[PDB]
Amino acid sequence: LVHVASVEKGRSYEDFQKVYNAIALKLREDDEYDNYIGYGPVLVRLAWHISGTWDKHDNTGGSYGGTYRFKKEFNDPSNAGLQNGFKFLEPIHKEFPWISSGDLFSLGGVTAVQEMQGPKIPWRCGRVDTPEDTTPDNGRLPDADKDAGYVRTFFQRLNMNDREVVALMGAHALGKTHLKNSGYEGGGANNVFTNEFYLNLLNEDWKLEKNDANNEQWDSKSGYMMLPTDYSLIQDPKYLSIVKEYANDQDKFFKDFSKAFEKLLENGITFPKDAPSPFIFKTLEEQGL
Ligand code: HEM
């Protein structure tokens, strides 16, 4: 399968900056969501889940087709809770009906990262909605109750290496788990993008406990939690080295996350040689808005 990026007709940087701005303004406005976390984290998770269905072997899944809009994918047990992100984006899509679904979902993630003070993430337009029969089956997103070997193997399907995996997982500085969604009991949440996932891993006194859904998770007295797959990053010696690197270099983490997240959001897409360069959107703050 080949998915060729096709620019929404006549659109350019300014059009997409307007969409970015609408998302960013709504992120600022709707501040009460999820006990005042806001919609930032769920939008990042949405962008990842619509991308993380990709399979490098046959180019099925991925962000291109915007298939999360279809019931099979929308109702994936792995996507429980993301409906909130979709509902957030609905009025945005209504205001800008010309943007494709894949472009909107991925741009939501970029906007959220940047507005939460994370790194700039270059972003490319041109995802094109594909039909319902192109929706990937459930079961392509990762389990959280597994070890480092599982994580490593899983991410090979997305063409991610050890550094890319550890960098991407840094997004777990954001938001929280919700028992009703995933069977994991949320701890201290955050809506500012930093390298504190790695600092928490290395510095907290972690205890392996069972939550009210009878699943194991790692908890600290300070009120933080880690999934078994999160904690696996300090159990595996190769992942541990990289965790230490990012814990000690905020800029390096930002740069590596930016590259890995763009790659994740672009997997499966063929960009014509004369396609526009990636866009780097200004934050509301940078615009004085
Ligand atoms: C082994 C890989 C991963 C596993 C097993 C995993 C699992 C989970 C689980 C179980 C939750 C809780 C969902 C809920 O209860 O609402 C969660 C939340 C989240 N995940 Fe991951 N995740 C992984 C990788 C990633 C990646 C690569 C990203 C983005 C780069 C990401 C971004 C997020 C964000 C931002 C949240 C917070 C959502 C919210 O607060 O509503 N995760 N993850």
Side-chain angles (χ1 to χ4, degrees):
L1 292 181
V2 179
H3 289 141
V4 181
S6 182
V7 178
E8 288 93 336
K9 181 172 187 57
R11 303 290 168 179
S12 61
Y13 179 73
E14 65 173 357
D15 295 282
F16 298 99
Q17 179 77 69
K18 289 177 186 175
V19 182
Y20 177 105
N21 286 357
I23 297 167
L25 285 162
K26 190 176 173 62
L27 277 172
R28 178 191 283 170
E29 176 72 7
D30 299 352
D31 68 331
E32 303 178 8
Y33 173 77
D34 207 2
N35 293 131
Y36 289 87
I37 298 170
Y39 283 92
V42 74
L43 290 181
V44 174
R45 193 180 201 235
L46 178 62
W48 139 237
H49 278 205
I50 62 93
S51 303
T53 57
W54 186 60
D55 188 337
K56 71 183 177 179
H57 298 97
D58 57 11
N59 196 19
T60 56
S63 71
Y64 184 85
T67 53
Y68 173 85
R69 74 189 189 277
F70 297 117
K71 59 184 177 184
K72 182 172 65 176
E73 183 169 347
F74 195 86
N75 289 327
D76 187 349
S78 299
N79 288 337
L82 293 182
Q83 302 96 332
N84 295 116
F86 185 83
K87 290 182 179 182
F88 175 100
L89 293 171
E90 279 183 336
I92 309 296
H93 213 168
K94 286 196 174 187
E95 180 181 358
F96 304 97
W98 52 264
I99 196 170
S100 67
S101 292
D103 279 0
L104 182 58
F105 303 148
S106 61
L107 182 56
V110 168
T111 305
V113 170
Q114 299 194 173
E115 293 297 305
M116 293 187 290
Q117 304 167 232
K120 290 310 188 72
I121 317 288
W123 178 88
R124 299 186 88 163
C125 73
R127 297 167 189 77
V128 178
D129 287 11
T130 57
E132 189 155 17
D133 67 353
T134 66
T135 305
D137 285 350
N138 297 353
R140 295 183 174 214
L141 295 159
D143 296 334
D145 65 334
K146 303 290 194 287
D147 64 8
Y150 169 87
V151 172
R152 181 168 283 117
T153 297
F154 174 87
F155 273 105
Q156 289 171 350
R157 201 200 72 224
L158 295 175
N159 192 39
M160 297 296 178
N161 66 17
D162 282 6
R163 294 184 64 85
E164 293 167 315
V165 169
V166 175
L168 287 169
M169 212 77 73
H172 280 179
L174 301 171
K176 66 183 290 287
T177 66
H178 311 83
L179 203 71
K180 59 182 171 60
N181 289 343
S182 64
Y184 293 97
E185 184 78 60
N190 210 336
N191 57 14
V192 179
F193 195 101
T194 69
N195 69 339
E196 288 174 21
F197 171 81
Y198 309 104
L199 292 163
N200 292 344
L201 275 169
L202 298 174
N203 295 335
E204 297 297 312
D205 189 4
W206 299 105
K207 310 300 184 182
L208 183 60
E209 303 185 327
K210 258 190 177 181
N211 64 36
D212 290 343
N214 201 41
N215 299 314
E216 289 192 314
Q217 57 180 71
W218 295 88
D219 300 326
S220 79
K221 65 172 187 56
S222 56
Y224 299 116
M225 67 80 77
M226 291 287 168
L227 301 162
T229 45
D230 294 326
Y231 196 81
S232 84
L233 304 184
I234 63 171
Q235 292 177 313
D236 177 275
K238 303 189 198 73
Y239 284 154
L240 177 60
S241 296
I242 304 161
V243 167
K244 289 175 178 174
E245 183 183 348
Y246 293 149
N248 287 283
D249 194 337
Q250 295 176 277
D251 183 60
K252 182 61 168 160
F253 167 54
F254 270 30
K255 288 176 178 167
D256 285 356
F257 180 88
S258 177
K259 287 183 175 66
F261 194 59
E262 179 176 12
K263 174 180 166 174
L264 178 74
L265 274 49
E266 293 173 3
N267 273 338
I269 309 174
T270 297
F271 294 95
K273 290 309 181 66
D274 60 350
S277 298
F279 302 133
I280 300 181
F281 299 112
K282 302 180 183 65
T283 60
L284 293 180
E285 190 172 53
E286 286 172 327
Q287 295 172 88
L289 296 174

